[PDB]
Structure 1
Amino acid sequence: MVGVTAFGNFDLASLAIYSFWIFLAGLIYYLQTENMREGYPLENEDGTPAANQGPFPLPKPKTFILPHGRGTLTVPGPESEDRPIALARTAVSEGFPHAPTGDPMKDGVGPASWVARRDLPELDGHGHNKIKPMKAAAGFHVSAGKNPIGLPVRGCDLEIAGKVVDIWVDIPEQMARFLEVELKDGSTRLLPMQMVKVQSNRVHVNALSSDLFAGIPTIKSPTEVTLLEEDKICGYVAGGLMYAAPKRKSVVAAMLAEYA
């Protein structure tokens, strides 16, 4: 079949390439349609629906049947965020920042934001709790690397705000998730591991300073952690990067601020 044409130069090479162009257009449409299942419809900065919705229409809803009798999530659906946002718009026109009205970290807006998830712990496959302190877990032990239990915890201002008591691990996943860090208030806070730098003599936290360690949202029950409060803790620890920038003893930051 080498080289006969149906018309002009059109052969199976050309038929295949044009068929692929059509198929690719259809596939791109389908992929974007699947990706329009969270966050839509679009809205103005004042909450009312926008005149924009886009060239791509919303897909038909599909239902996820949650495991462990948690119910059903059907998407796309009506999305509200079931919490008040403490922001005030800077300009009357659109596409401008909304400045925080009170304390930004702690009303939970910006990089310190959090989401109202279900106030329940996520479960492993067998139904138990997924994340658990070392003492509550049976058989787990620090297996390699510098064991952080018993070390002081230093903030971004080169003060020590507490010291490590226990590790929260993720049972099926077999990896450490939180540092239970206890202050000389006596109450304990949770530290995401990916926000802490475990050194030989010291657990450094670039995010926060000592005075902000007390503000971390504490845990409802003392052996478990729910999704809501994980957002709450993670959002505050992470928003500490911008909102605790002044209080930080960084050579390069002081360098640039003195020049600026």
Structure 2
Amino acid sequence: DLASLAIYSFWIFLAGLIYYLQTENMREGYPLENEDGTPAANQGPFPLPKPKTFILPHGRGTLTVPGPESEDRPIALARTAVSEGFPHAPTGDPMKDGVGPASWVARRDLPELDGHGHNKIKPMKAAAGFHVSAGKNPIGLPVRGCDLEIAGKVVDIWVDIPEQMARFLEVELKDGSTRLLPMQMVKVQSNRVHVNALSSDLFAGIPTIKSPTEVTLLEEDKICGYVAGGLMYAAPKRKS
């Protein structure tokens, strides 16, 4: 035996489980491509799974995966070698082009909705009655970049309503327009908010939102993309 039977059976089950698990995780990104975008030759031993359809709430439609994959966006890179597997150099300014660590996905250009169908992220001013409840309130702090120049000033916190947590700092620039900075990329200190990723002069370069009381999945990716890329690409102006 019984124990032998039980162990033998298990291993067989386990093998099937791994199969089901591996194929499940091939719902996105697959089939494999060559650097040119054509389907790569060897896909490996695992098949693609029969697709599945997720029903999005709030009439936002469906997603069905696996499905036809594409970037739905230009990619400012070019090869730097004559054979597969070497880096691809940015054709332009990688920050503005949204490549490398500055990369953003062409997600939906609407904002995530909470369970009730309302915008999930709001500026706190338009969010009632949300307020800072613990820790240093960043609102009104000057914002300093990795070049140690002030780049602006915090003029609200954007917050996740269902989850009640800070997601962005809305920051005013020398020209009086604003930008969202990912909460996770700023250090609130006693007397200032510090941003290591960007030098002061790249703040204006941050992607901007089309409407000033929401932010869409797409603009979030451009913004988080842009700022993270700062790490690699503002390496010239940093320093300390």
Q: TM-score, normalised by structure 2?
A: 0.99
Give the C-alpha shift of residue 201 in structure 1. 0.5
Give the C-alpha shift of residue 179 in structure 1. 0.3
**Equivalence for 2:19:** 29
1:91 aligns with one of 81, 88, 103 = 81
What SS does the aligned partner of 1:106 have?
helix
Give the C-alpha shift of residue 247 in structure 1. 0.5
1 CA distance for matches of 2:152 and 2:193? 10
After TM superposition, list the pairs within 5 Å mapping 1:89-168 onto structure 2.
Answer: 89-168=79-158
Give the C-alpha shift of residue 72 in structure 1. 0.8
2 CA distance for matches of 1:52 and 1:92? 20
Give the C-alpha shift of residue 52 in structure 1. 1.2
Give the C-alpha shift of residue 20 in structure 1. 0.9
The superposition leaves residues 61-108 of structure 1 with CA deviations (integer Å, 9 ceiling, x where unpaired) of 110111000111111010111111010101110111000011011111
What SS does the aligned partner of 2:95 have?
coil
2 CA distance for matches of 1:206 and 1:154? 8
2 CA distance for matches of 1:94 and 1:115? 24
Give the C-alpha shift of residue 33 in structure 1. 0.9
1 CA distance for matches of 2:20 and 2:131? 47
The superposition leaves residues 201-231 of structure 1 with CA deviations (integer Å, 9 ceiling, x where unpaired) of 0100000011000110111001100010000
1 CA distance for matches of 2:21 and 2:49? 11
The superposition leaves residues 125-173 of structure 1 with CA deviations (integer Å, 9 ceiling, x where unpaired) of 0011110011101111110000000111110011111011101000010
Q: Point out 4+ residue stretches in structure 1 off by more than 2 angstroms.
A: none
**Equivalence for 2:50:** 60
Give the C-alpha shift of residue 43 in structure 1. 0.8
5+ residue gaps in structure 2?
none
**What do you get for the CA RMSD once the two structures are aligned?**
0.7
What SS does the aligned partner of 1:88 have?
strand
Larger radius of gyration: 1
After TM superposition, list the pairs within 5 Å mapping 1:224-243 onto structure 2.
Answer: 224-243=214-233
1 CA distance for matches of 2:125 and 2:188? 20
**Equivalence for 1:13:** 3
Structure number with greater CO (CA < 8 Å, separation at least 6) is 2
What SS does the aligned partner of 1:234 have?
helix
5+ residue gaps in structure 1?
1-10, 251-260
2 CA distance for matches of 1:89 and 1:28? 36
Give the C-alpha shift of residue 184 in structure 1. 1.7
What SS does the aligned partner of 2:159 have?
strand
2 CA distance for matches of 1:178 and 1:247? 24
1 CA distance for matches of 2:203 and 2:61? 36
| Residue 196 (1) aligns with residue 186 (2) | yes
Give the C-alpha shift of residue 54 in structure 1. 1.2
What SS does the aligned partner of 2:81 have?
coil
2 CA distance for matches of 1:184 and 1:208? 16
2 CA distance for matches of 1:243 and 1:215? 13
* Number of equivalences: 240
2 CA distance for matches of 1:231 and 1:75? 21
